[PDB]
Write a protein that binds this ligand. Structure first.
Ligand SMILES: [Zn+2]
Length: 38
């Protein structure tokens, strides 16, 4: 292994999705933006 980034998919609590923990914050920006629940 070398090019294998440990992106690590974890369970987002915001949409309930398997998303990279390494990208969870940027994801959350998109996630929270989209997840405007009313
Ligand atoms: Zn999410």
């Amino acid at each position: 292994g070398k090019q294998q980034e440990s992106s690590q998919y974890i369970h987002c609590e915001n949409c309930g999705r398997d998303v990279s923990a390494n990208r969870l914050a940027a994801h959350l920006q998109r996630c929270l933006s989209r997840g405007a629940r009313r």
